[PDB]
Amino acid sequence: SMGYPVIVEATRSPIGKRNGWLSGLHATELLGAVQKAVVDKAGIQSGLHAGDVEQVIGGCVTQFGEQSNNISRVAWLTAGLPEHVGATTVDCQSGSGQQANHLIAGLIAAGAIDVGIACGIEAMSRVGLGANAGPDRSLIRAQSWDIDLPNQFEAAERIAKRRGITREDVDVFGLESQRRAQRAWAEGRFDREISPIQAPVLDEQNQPTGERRLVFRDQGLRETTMAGLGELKPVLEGGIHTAGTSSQISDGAAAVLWMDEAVARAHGLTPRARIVAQALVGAEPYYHLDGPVQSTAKVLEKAGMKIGDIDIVEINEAFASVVLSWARVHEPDMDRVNVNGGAIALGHPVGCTGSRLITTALHELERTDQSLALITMCAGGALSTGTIIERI
């Protein structure tokens, strides 16, 4: 009546740019394709079928329109998967896709389910940030609200000033994210984790042409130089972050298949990883997005580990300053941080990214035959998710 949760499979779509390669897919189609993909992948060398999954939990931030009404469920049904499977959609802002994994692991630990999928979706081309708040944003908080909680761009600058991070510092970091992303793609590091996705071809306007083709690669990569980044214009007046040093607006989905260990064996699936420690903590509202400092501290503490014990770190590149702040505090070996690039180069479909990072981290641990990875993300509402996973 108690479970031992392990990851048995993980996959993700390539990540499309805004109005890009995946923008012709209904949000429910994009998530549905990735849910089905993780099941199909597990099915190749086992007898596992979609009907064996008991619950799906998916992260999604802007739960409006195509992404409202429990997209995790609507996606499952839209993809033609079995109706008896339960589904829930969760929102802790950009932490959502990561928390989705924590939550599935918990249901397995409790003996509630033996097989579950944790996933994440965001189709930002079709449902943009703030679509869920309505036209008068003043209305979404109570009159009494008196917390200095800045928007994401102001946050990035407040964090930069807090650490003495310059335009030079962030441009250097943004260059390196593009370089590592390109290296990963040139070497084929993402081949295992990606499920290529069929998508409608768009004419030069954004109407479908009738064409439907496979999309293989992350669209956000582009040739980048220090000089080129230096010409970029800051999002805010007096700011240091530009499009070249901020996460991209993107479309994508990711899914991770979890099982109780003994049940994995019965299905003939190999346990690949487990959670050593997990957390979702609150951060300092003034800075808003400096929470990775706290979530990292918390999982290290729970695991009885130090930053040096970790082989691979995935810290979401919401903005360059978020990562540089975390680094100044935790003093990691940066050769171990976002080794295949991050959201500055690869994109950040907000509700997807948490599951995407767990997927990317696991595959990098396997590629290099290493053991421990830390995943940490800043999140809206001054929150941060953290996970330490270990290979089995």
d(CA 95, CA 97): 6
Among 112, 133, 172, 232, binds ligand COA (CB under 6 A): 232
> What is the distance in angstroms between the CA of the first residue and the CA of the last residue of the chain?
22
d(CA 349, CA 339): 19
CA distances from 325 to 73, 109, 166, 168, 220 (A): 38, 34, 12, 15, 24
Q: CB-based burial of residue 238 (10 Å sphere; 0-12 exposed, 13-18 middle, 19+ buried)?
A: exposed
d(CA 107, CA 116): 9
Tokens representing 54 are 């008991």
d(CA 234, CA 26): 32
249 near ligand COA, judged by CB under 6 A: yes
d(CA 112, CA 58): 17
Tokens representing 78 are 């839209």
219 near ligand COA, judged by CB under 6 A: no
Stretch binding a copy of itself (CB under 8 A), from 97-105, 180-188, 217-225, 332-340 = 97-105
Specify whether the CB–CB gap between 326 and 293 falls below 8 A: yes
Among 126, 298, 330, 348, binds ligand COA (CB under 6 A): 348
Q: How far is the CB of 334 from a copy of itself (least distance, A)?
A: 27
Beta-carbon contacts of 54 under 8 Å, excluding residues fewer than 6 positions away, are 85, 86, 113, 114, 115, 116
Among 119, 318, 358, 389, binds ligand COA (CB under 6 A): 318
- Residue 94 contact partner, candidates a copy of itself, ligand 3G6, Cl ion, none, CB within 5 to 8 A by sort of partner: ligand 3G6
Q: How far is the CB of 354 from a copy of itself (least distance, A)?
A: 11
* Binding footprint of ligand 3G6, residue count (CB under 6 A): 15
Of 226 and 262, which CB lies nearer to a copy of itself in the complex structure? 262
Q: How far is the CB of 39 from Cl ion (least distance, A)?
A: 5
Residue with tokens 């003034």: 286
CA distances from 379 to 117, 173, 201, 292 (A): 22, 20, 33, 9
d(CA 63, CA 154): 24
Mask for 280-319, x = binds ligand 3G6 (CB under 6 A): --------------------------------------x-
Site for a copy of itself in 111-170 (CB under 8 A): 111-112, 132-134, 139-145, 147, 149
Stretch binding a copy of itself (CB under 8 A), from 71-79, 162-170, 335-343, 366-374 = 71-79
The residue whose Cβ lies closest to ligand COA is 243
Among 94, 177, 250, 325, binds ligand 3G6 (CB under 6 A): 94
- Residue 249 contact partner, candidates ligand COA, a copy of itself, Cl ion, none, CB within 5 to 8 A by sort of partner: ligand COA
* Binding footprint of ligand COA, residue count (CB under 6 A): 19
Specify whether the CB–CB gap between 315 and 234 falls below 8 A: no
Give contact residues for ligand 3G6 (rule: CB under 6 A): 61, 69, 93-94, 129-130, 133, 137, 140, 151-152, 318, 350, 379-380
Give contact residues for a copy of itself (rule: CB under 8 A): 2, 4-5, 26, 28-29, 55, 63-66, 68-70, 73-74, 77-78, 82-93, 95-96, 99, 102-103, 105-112, 132-134, 139-145, 147, 149, 275, 277-285, 294, 380-383
